[PDB]
Structure 1
Amino acid sequence: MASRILLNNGAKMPILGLGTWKSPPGQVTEAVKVAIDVGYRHIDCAHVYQNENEVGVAIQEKLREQVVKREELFIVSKLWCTYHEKGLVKGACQKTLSDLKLDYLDLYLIHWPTGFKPGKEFFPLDESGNVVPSDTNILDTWAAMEELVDEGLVKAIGISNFNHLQVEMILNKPGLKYKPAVNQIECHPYLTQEKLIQYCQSKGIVVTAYSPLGSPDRPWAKPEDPSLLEDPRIKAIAAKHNKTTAQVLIRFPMQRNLVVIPKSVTPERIAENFKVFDFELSSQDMTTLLSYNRNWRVCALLSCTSHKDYPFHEEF
């Protein structure tokens, strides 16, 4: 298992990164510092997570300390839905750069295919509670992303939560200048994504798996929901390999040629989660884990199910 995967922009991306959604601002600086100390070279960020300033403090301190060089880091962020407008994309990217203390991003993603009305609110609602859309389409937003590459602000651009028809729309864009490098999607044994993964990989687009542990800290969790970390079938595979259940859940996408971004703010778990380059799941193990699919989503974007670009009506 090599540590990096080659992207279609010619750059290499570390296959294991640190997630930062829900990482409290008072804990995430330490989390990222510890992560870099124990070997992480890829951090997954987003403006909407409201903690990029604090992530940036950690990155900058480790650069200043010469623990790592900037070229050895792979920093990812995402354009939020209220910034899909041509005239807002650069400023959104620049705000993220300023917060992260960087002069470029390694990868910048369209966070969701759905554009929302610009303004202070991340989810602008009408008087009845539906998200208020933007009229700006996926293709014009993509053109704005391409401009960021040409201005030196980002080294690669990609997409997140795009279904295969939406990926296809970009690939078929008239005058397409840069193909998406990455599609970041939810993926774990309860949402195995075989169809979408195959499609993206066949087009040379690298897939990043989010919520690989099933996001037990997701704010809308309910007691009756399935739980990957507590699934005795997965625990059994972990026990056989003398690893933790989380380590199995992280190794699983790695062996499918995916990038994976487990989140933790717990120093011991941050270190644990990185120790996944010392064992191999068998083909049988992999197929067994795949068999647990139930099309269950942590992130279903439920306030946007009527948006013209809602991604999850399509089968994949």
Structure 2
Amino acid sequence: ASRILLNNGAKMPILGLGTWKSPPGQVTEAVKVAIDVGYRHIDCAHVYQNENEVGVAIQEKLREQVVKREELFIVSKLWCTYHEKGLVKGACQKTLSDLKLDYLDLYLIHWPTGFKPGKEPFPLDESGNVVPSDTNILDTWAAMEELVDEGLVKAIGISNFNHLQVEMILNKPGLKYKPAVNQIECHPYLTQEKLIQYCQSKGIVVTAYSPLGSPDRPWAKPEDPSLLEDPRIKAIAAKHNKTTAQVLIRFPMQRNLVVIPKSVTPERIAENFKVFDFELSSQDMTTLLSYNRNWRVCALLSCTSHKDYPFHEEF
């Protein structure tokens, strides 16, 4: 099926469009093309500095009568510098304003780490370290809950949380809403078997980000592994007369994950959606899981001393 049931009763499309590193000069057209070829889920964030332009595209296609708001599933995330209770509603309302929406379908705590409040999204000290804020995960969760109760968002969730951090929330006395989603990096080099098992056993939906290995990530090194260029995956793709990207997108769908590949190239936006017409075999799946190397695209070294850094724990 094309959508997965969340803990709030709403249905979430399992295939969505990613928007990190989509420039404002091209993301409006990306989203318009996306909606035209069938995407209904768009993954956004204030830190991506392009929510206005995403909002332009959504607004235009509503006006064109291509889709209705109820048909769309729009996600954004609360950035690290806004974890203070008194800053959360404002941050959410900035996102809604920019996206020209009156609600979000899902709002995530982007990272478990709070950063020093201010205009700078990555506040560093003079020696390179991120400057933390004195906020904690549960106070931030409480403030996210408030957004549901005010109707600004229909569901809340988390992202880049390890299983101990998820459990902190689950075990919160007087919890109001359980997280609906944990969005994490996931691809054949970082297969996340244990955290996926944990989350699914708790009734939390997992979204896989960077499913193509984020080749456009700004800190890529020539020597890094390259998923789209892996000859082993290319051979699985050839067998199915599909591209490597289609295989990489289909792989998490068959693990009962949501997946959010990013592109601003119209041909690829279309190509990437054409993944509901074939199945990977049991052997394909096994083979792709075997490529795990615990290799993360997303893990800023300047944050490794933060008290809440998520990736010291095994999972």
- TM-score, normalised to structure 1, is 0.99
Say which SS state the counterpart of residue 207 (structure 2) adopts: strand
Structure 2 CA distance, aligned partners of 1:125 and 1:292? 35
Query: Which deviations, in whole Å up to 9, do the C-alpha atoms of 1:65-95 show, x marking residues without a partner?
Result: 1100000000000000000000000000000
> Once the 2 structures are TM-superposed, how far is the Cα of residue 284 of structure 1 from its aligned partner?
1.0
Aligned-residue sequence identity (percent) comes to 100
Shift of 1:129: 1.7
Equivalent-residue separation in structure 2 for 1:201 and 1:12 (angstroms):
16
Segments of structure 1 that go 5 or more residues without pairing to the other structure are none
Aligned to 2:30: 31
Q: Provide runs of 4+ in structure 1 moved above 4 Å.
A: none
Q: Distance in 2 between matches of 1:115 and 1:217?
A: 26
Report how many aligned residue pairs link the two structures: 315
Per the alignment, residue 187 of structure 1 pairs with 186
Q: Which residue of 2 aligns with 1:302?
A: 301
Per-residue CA deviations over 1:98-128 (Å, capped at 9, x if unaligned) read 0000000000000000001100100111122
SS at match of 2:121: coil
Unaligned runs of 5+ in 2: none
CA deviations 1:22-58 (Å, max 9, x no partner) are 0010000000000000000000000000000000000
SS of residue matched to 1:170: helix
1:146 is paired with a residue of what secondary structure? helix
Measured after TM superposition, the shift of residue 64 of structure 1 is 0.8
Per-residue deviation at 1:301?
Answer: 2.3
C-alpha distance in 2 between matches for 1:64 and 1:200: 38
CA distance, structure 2, for counterparts of residue 162 and residue 149 of structure 1:
20
**1 CA distance for matches of 2:28 and 2:159?**
25
User: How far did residue 160 of structure 1 move?
Assistant: 0.2
Once residues 48 and 287 of structure 1 are traced to their aligned partners in structure 2, the CA distance between those partners, rounded to angstroms, is 36
Quick check: 294-303 or 86-95, which moved more?
294-303
- CA deviation map 1:131-168 (0-9, x unaligned): 11111100000000000000000000000000000001
Give the match's secondary structure for 1:242.
coil
- Whole-Å separation in 2 of the counterparts to 1:146 and 1:16: 26
Q: Distance in 2 between matches of 1:165 and 1:47?
A: 26
1:222-271, Cα deviation, whole Å (9 max, x unpaired): 11100000101100000000000000000000000000000000000000
Q: Determine the C-alpha separation between the residues in 2 that align with 1:129 and 1:245.
A: 37
SS at match of 1:124: coil
Aligned-residue Cα RMSD (Å) equals 0.5
Instruction: Normalising by structure 2, report the TM-score.
Output: 1.00
Q: Within 2, Cα distance between the matches of 1:59 and 1:270?
A: 16
SS in 2 for 1:88: helix
User: Aligned equivalents of 2:298 and 2:44: distance in 1?
Assistant: 16
Q: Give SS of 1:270's match.
A: helix
Please give the per-residue CA displacement for 1:172-218, whole angstroms capped at 9, x wherever unaligned: 11111100000000000000000000000000000000000000100
